[PDB]
Design a binder for these strands. Structure first.
Ligand code: CL
Ligand code: CL
Ligand code: MN
Ligand code: MN
Ligand code: MN
Ligand code: MN
Ligand code: MN
Ligand code: MN
Ligand code: MN
Ligand code: MN
Lengths: 99, 93, 105, 84, 96, 78, 104, 92
DNA sequence: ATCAATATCCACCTGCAGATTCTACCAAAAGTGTATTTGGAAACTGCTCCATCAAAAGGCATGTTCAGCTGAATTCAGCTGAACATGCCTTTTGATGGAGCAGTTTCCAAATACACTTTTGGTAGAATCTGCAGGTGGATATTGAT
DNA sequence: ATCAATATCCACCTGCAGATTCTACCAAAAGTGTATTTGGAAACTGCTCCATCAAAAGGCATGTTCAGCTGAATTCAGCTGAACATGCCTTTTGATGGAGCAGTTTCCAAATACACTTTTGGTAGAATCTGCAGGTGGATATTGAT
């Protein structure tokens, strides 16, 4: 036509896709570097078992997905469809993660 | 190096409820974490109970109260059933 | 030689649970019935989760329970979901759930 | 080993988008990506700090899965599947 | 003389945030507690400090819940708390 | 019994939580919330009562119930 | 000649030791553990009474009441995090009105 | 008969504020506080020793427990006080 | 904007009641001296498994364009919820008797710990079995431009 | 009210990585005997807690009035989604060197055990003395009329 889906159709297509699957959604190597940089500032010369890095990525991705669910409810509560930083701060605040 | 786990017992119970069904080792690891988690929650709550009541012994009575305090609703009723049944059957020699 | 599990009618190991109660500094003494009761409850809750996850594995036309099936079984059951409300299942994903307000008008 | 800098930027915009999709989000404002990086970094600091404390108490140089599991549990973020 | 809407409401916020007295009348609360307890165990007695502990906890819980409800109302560009505000707050807290 | 918890008293609680304006459906919603709270805590406290073979719910029973529920209270023996 | 004075403390080293032995925490208890634990308890107590003494004279009373302890806990960022899921009975709340609620 | 920390909470109050007293209810609140932090540190100490297959709770477990439980500056000063008390106790 | 009128904080008394503090007695707990055992640190070493690299390949991040449609701004009026007066009933306060029951003894019969000895279920590993991942089709909705 | 475009679904197919069974040793359950503890069962105390009582203040229920908040309607600038070219950098699979878990042994600084002595902390009255309930009168704020 050239064919072109309308804004929102692919986003809903991706919600369905990623809610069916369980694969980690952050790239592995970059995340492992993030973990070692943060650990390196706490204690130098640390080593990691590889399952210790996977445990952190599994926990970090479940936290963020969960946070994004609550963020979405706060956006929809404000009569929006778009998540904004104020939504994350409201969710984090009601969870007791921030004063 | 010899590492205990609950895997053979989980697998037996799996065969009971689904004779045709198996389990990936990752799913076994989730079941092992489950058993150990509920163990510590029940045992810990039973440890407190015995302590609040100035008792030095954790008995099936402490286990049962801990179970009531920890499990929601129907899950508690049924666990108490199985637990009471196993104890009476155990004591009847 | 009769195992305490067979005496109690249980698949879970009464002797291991007893040792685990003793070595865990839970109390100075452990009654003979406490490991029996506890091992029965652990067996029961395990059977409860395996039943529901077996069913999910069959709805998905699969012969082998994977973590995903454990998640579906837990999060779709109000009481298991409450009990495991602060637990993460590695490789479990989430439940399919799109807020109505987001579906096309 | 080469020195590690700025690796929170390896948490890319498309990876955050994907996470938000699994969380049900349809539309994402432009400023969400750096908020998420800030939130994720606070999260990892709190858990890794606790994990490394367990390591150092055991006199090890190697963070183990168990260290991460005990740290997750303390933060009220219990994790199943890595209990070895 | 007649104060405009909201002027007395703000005055009450300042009054009650300054004080620490229990804000629910004692006998209704005690009657409600005994009723609820009756659905789990009969002919129960209560220590008076047991009831005071429950009332202290119940009021601190509800006050805290009204703070999060209020933030959810402000977030939706309102000044009035509505049931959906309470419901959102309880959803994010994990109480639902 | 639950309507013993009156509209003026719910307003006072909301006031202490900084609320300025209150919708009319709030009071019945608040009573239901308070009822779930009291059920959950009293169920647990009474479980501590029955386990100690007592007929009297003690302050300590409530204290322990509130700790179990993530609602630690100071000032009543714990 | 008590262990408290020997460690230079007001809090009871001897009692903390008994409570550790009888609390089902571990088979055995080192000698310095009750000392170290007694010292941490005395320090956190001194910190709170420090600030709550202040809250009480900032209000013209000889006597610390629960309201003063609540004001001290909640106006201090680190004590507030430590006591984040704790209720001070008769403590009330911190005065605080959202900006958007104020007049004009 | 009925132990509490009132006597020691009062001794610390005079050290920091000789002029100031404390009400019955506020004393009960400090007793709750001491018992709470005690059980938090002791339970954490307990799990540390178990995770590491040790049967003894020593001041080293107490210290790691304090590091894990107190948030930042509270942790640094608490670790200093405990370290001091163990030193002074050992010396004489 | 300011002046006038009304209403509400809130700083400051006083004279008690009640709640703290102050004293003295005494069992229960902490300290002590002396003897004896033992968890776990230190040293030593086997051998996982972690850090690091190499290379090839292509899955995926990035940057750009373009405009659909979302959020933000604005107006407005219906009607909900705040303020207030008034009449009343539920809570507060008091007391007073009695009883339901904690809380406490002194207790043995039952139950539990513990050292030795023997039996076997459970685990590590190699040997075997096999779902299903990951391809390759078309069959079926589903969406969006006319 | 129909069709091109595109994504999504659904079968079948197989061999290989991942699960299941096999196997043989052995750590830790179970059996036995015996030393030690416990906690339920008896008869008690002396309380707190419940139950009427009963009169009375002040907090609540109610009806009136209208201020102004909410949400419905409308408009539109520009942010964010969709699509695409481009090419970087993650992923996958082995290699290998050695750091450092983890497994054993040795033996002692430090833990427990126990009998007895000292001192502390709980308690419950006597002897303070703080702060609550009222007053008031000025500070400060709100609301109407200009
Ligand atoms: Cl038992
Ligand atoms: Cl020590
Ligand atoms: Mn660094
Ligand atoms: Mn040894
Ligand atoms: Mn819109
Ligand atoms: Mn109008
Ligand atoms: Mn065999
Ligand atoms: Mn497939
Ligand atoms: Mn004394
Ligand atoms: Mn007054």
């Amino acid at each position: 036509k050239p064919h072109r889906y309308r804004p929102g159709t692919v986003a809903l297509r991706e919600i369905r896709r990623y809610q069916k699957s369980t694969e980690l959604l952050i790239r592995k190597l970059p995340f492992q570097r993030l973990v070692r940089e943060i650990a390196q500032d706490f204690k130098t010369d640390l080593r990691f078992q590889s399952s210790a890095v996977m445990a952190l990525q599994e926990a970090s991705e479940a936290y963020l997905v969960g946070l994004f669910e609550d963020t979405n409810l706060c956006a929809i509560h404000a009569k929006r469809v778009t998540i904004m930083p104020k939504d994350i701060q409201l969710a984090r605040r009601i969870r007791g993660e921030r004063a | 190096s010899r590492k205990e786990s609950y895997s053979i017992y989980v697998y037996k119970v799996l065969k009971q409820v689904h004779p045709d069904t198996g389990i990936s080792s990752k799913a076994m690891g989730i079941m092992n974490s489950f058993v150990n988690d509920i163990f510590e929650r029940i045992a810990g709550e039973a440890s407190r109970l015995a302590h609040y009541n100035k008792r030095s012994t954790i008995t099936s009575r402490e286990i049962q109260t801990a179970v009531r305090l920890l499990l929601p609703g129907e899950l508690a009723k049924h666990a108490v059933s199985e637990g009471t049944k196993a104890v009476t059957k155990y004591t009847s020699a | 030689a009769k195992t305490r599990s067979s005496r109690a009618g249980l698949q879970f190991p009464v002797g291991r649970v007893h040792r685990l109660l003793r070595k865990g500094n839970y109390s100075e003494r452990v009654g003979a019935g406490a490991p029996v009761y506890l091992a029965a409850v652990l067996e029961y809750l395990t059977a409860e989760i395996l039943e529901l996850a077996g069913n999910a594995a069959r709805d998905n036309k699969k012969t082998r329970i994977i973590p995903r099936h454990l998640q579906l079984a837990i999060r779709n059951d109000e009481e298991l979901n409450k009990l495991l409300g602060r637990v993460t299942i590695a490789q479990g994903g989430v439940l399919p759930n799109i807020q109505a307000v987001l579906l096309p008008k | 080993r080469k020195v590690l800098r700025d690796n929170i930027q390896g948490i890319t915009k498309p990876a955050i988008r994907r996470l938000a999709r699994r969380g049900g989000v349809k539309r994402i404002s432009g400023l969400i990506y750096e908020e998420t990086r800030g939130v994720l970094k606070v999260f990892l600091e709190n858990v890794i700090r606790d994990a490394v404390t367990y390591t150092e108490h055991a006199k090890r140089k190697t963070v183990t899965a168990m260290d991460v599991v005990y740290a997750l549990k303390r933060q009220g973020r219990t994790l199943y599947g890595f209990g070895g």
